């Protein structure tokens, strides 16, 4: 009955899955799909840009974390919690976490560890929803995400 968790896992897992496999899931999103569809479209636009602009930072972090199996995914959860340890929460940090998740998911697929992608998506969702639920709700959840990353075209 935790709709925020379900919706968050749907968006994050869909992005990690399509990034790792290179194939979009052509099923419609679950109900509340307008918001979820827009969020995944926004996440593609922003997340693809983050991975391209910051590939060097992402490759360096991946190389040092040495992610090989599902135990390393759990270790990554500890690190991800520290993304908010200074008391600051914003959508830039949240999308950076998800973007790195996609970056790692692509790595896991290349090393025949696709079974680790779903645990990775769940871990990212766990950190976001189980430790920053209150902030997410204040933003109107994924609607706030869509509206923040909406680039205004004002002629």
């Amino acid at each position: 009955s935790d709709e925020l968790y379900r919706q968050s896992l749907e968006i994050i897992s869909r992005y990690l899955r399509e990034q790792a496999t290179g194939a979009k899931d052509t099923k419609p999103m679950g109900r509340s799909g307008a918001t979820s569809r827009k969020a995944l479209e926004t996440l593609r636009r922003v997340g693809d840009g983050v991975q391209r602009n910051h590939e060097t930072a992402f490759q360096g972090m991946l190389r040092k974390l040495d992610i090989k199996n599902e135990d390393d995914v759990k270790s990554l959860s500890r690190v991800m919690i520290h993304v908010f340890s200074d008391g600051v929460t914003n959508w830039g940090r949240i999308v950076t976490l998800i973007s790195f998740g996609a970056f790692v998911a692509k790595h896991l697929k290349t090393i025949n560890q696709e079974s680790c992608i779903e645990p990775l998506a769940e871990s990212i969702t766990d950190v976001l929803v189980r430790t920053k639920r209150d902030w997410l709700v204040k933003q109107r959840g994924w609607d706030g995400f869509v509206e923040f990353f909406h680039v205004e075209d004002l002629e």
Binding site: M61, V88, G92, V95
Partner: peptide, 21 residues
């Protein structure tokens, strides 16, 4: 976890980029 601040700073750069968008 020592790498944590790197993620925070990068995330803040991304937030700052879109905040003026």
């Amino acid at each position: 976890i020592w790498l944590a601040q790197g993620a925070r700073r990068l995330g803040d750069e991304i937030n700052a980029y879109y905040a003026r968008r």
